[PDB]
Amino acid sequence: SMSVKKPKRDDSKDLALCSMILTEMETHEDAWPFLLPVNLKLVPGYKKVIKKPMDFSTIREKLSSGQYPNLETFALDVRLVFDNCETFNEDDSDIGRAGHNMRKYFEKKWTDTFK
Template identity: 55%
Template sequence: MPRGKWYCSNCHSKQPKKRNSSRRSHTKGGGTVKDSESSDHPPASPTPSTASNTNVEDAKEEAPTSAASSPRKETGNNRHLTKKQQRELAPCKILLEQLEQQDEAWPFLLPVNTKQFPTYKKIIKTPMDLSTIKKKLQDSNYKSRDEFCADVRQMFTNCEVFNEDDSPVGKAGHGMRTFFESRWMEITGTPPPAPVASSQTHS
């Protein structure tokens, strides 16, 4: 007779079956985990914080690649000018900065306040000031020195038309014009373009 317990086929069918208890299987780390078949609940999915952190890390890794691969946009206000025009207008930027630094520049730094001087618009048809000239220079609106020089002279002409020669503003205008004409010659090595006759007159 073979060793161990044994039953006949009829007795074995009557033997009570063991409950399918949760079986455990060993993992490589030495711990144990329940078999998914014996658990009433499916394995828990990664927590939202873990998933979000993973997405953040992936985004961080991809960001440098996308930034490096994207073409660099053209910047600067000189994109509308040729290199020859940029060289030609370079002295204009220098001279404009020097005009702004003069002690007599105070009447010309900003546009004339037409609320304070309501008749100004009736007399002066082409207002001009250093801030407007600077903005046009930065926006590459000037294509030549002549255009820049014409606006500077227009500013001084407006001053002469609207103000008396012996007034503080009138004196400042004459001093600034003299500085501009002489400094232009020193910086560019050529005399400034001939001034264009103005149609503005005293009212």
């Protein structure tokens, strides 16, 4: 509350560390469905159904331009990519499997780097 604060967690390396995670997600072999924004002209139903599209290149640009106020807003966008994928793709599809695999990969790096 006013003049009452928990001890200050060092957040000075968060930007660099989120960048390193994102690099590792970018270079994973199952990243291909997620590298670029979904083409809303060419994929029927996407625009109407997925209210907030998100992809790794859009996260990279937001990261590089100071549009994440803290490491939690960064994780929320990464999770959005996978939640969108599950909304639109059957579990038993190459893309559906890719999303599950990447979400796992992310959540481990997240826990190991920060928790």
